[PDB]
């Protein structure tokens, strides 16, 4: 098992995946976990889609929550895999949080800001703007990359990271949704 959180690259109390070297803060895993698991635990990237080996102690699994409208159980797992894959990629750091409100030009130019913290929240059924289809998830990810390409100079580090991470994402999308075209 690795020494730093797969998502935020910091230390502290870290939950180890039983199947890959990745370790996570409870709140950095997607979905965030409400407690430390007592027994076998496998992360979202390793968990089998068909036969789920364990349900998670997360917000969407609470009794009052799983009746609410939202993604199907199948689409929830697929979209969580897509979003956690984004968050664990080294290139993703500039997209974890919204751009600082001090960035005068950024917010003059980008009219529909998007970042991975918003996407994480909308995967939760209790969010007022919760996703109901995988198309909405894919649309927000693609909006995030479009904003990056719109604002940043093409030769900049962040512009390059955005373009390269988007290529990785579209590859994962075809892996996870081989039969669904999001055109």
């Amino acid at each position: 098992n690795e020494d730093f959180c797969a998502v935020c690259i910091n230390g502290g109390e870290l939950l180890c995946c039983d199947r890959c070297p990745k370790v996570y803060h409870l709140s950095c895993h997607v979905p965030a976990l409400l407690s430390f698991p007592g027994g076998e635990w496998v992360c979202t990237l390793c968990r089998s889609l068909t036969q789920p080996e364990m349900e998670y102690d997360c917000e969407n699994a609470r009794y009052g929550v799983r009746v609410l409208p939202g993604l199907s159980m199948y689409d929830q797992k697929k979209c969580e895999k897509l979003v956690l894959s984004l968050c664990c990629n080294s290139l993703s750091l500039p997209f974890h949080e919204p751009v600082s409100p001090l960035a005068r030009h950024y917010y003059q130019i980008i009219k529909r800001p998007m970042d991975l913290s918003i996407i994480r929240r909308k995967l939760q059924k209790k969010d007022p703007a919760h996703y109901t289809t995988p198309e909405e998830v894919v649309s927000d990810v693609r909006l995030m990359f479009w904003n990056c390409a719109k604002f940043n100079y093409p030769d900049s580090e962040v512009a390059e990271a955005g373009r390269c991470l988007e290529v990785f994402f579209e590859g994962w999308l075809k892996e996870i949704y081989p039969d669904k075209c999001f055109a």
Binding site: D3, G12, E13, C16, F36, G38, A103, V158
Partner: peptide
């Protein structure tokens, strides 16, 4: 359920 502790560090 293994956990570890690591020293914490546009």
């Amino acid at each position: 359920a293994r956990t570890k502790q690591t020293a914490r560090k546009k």
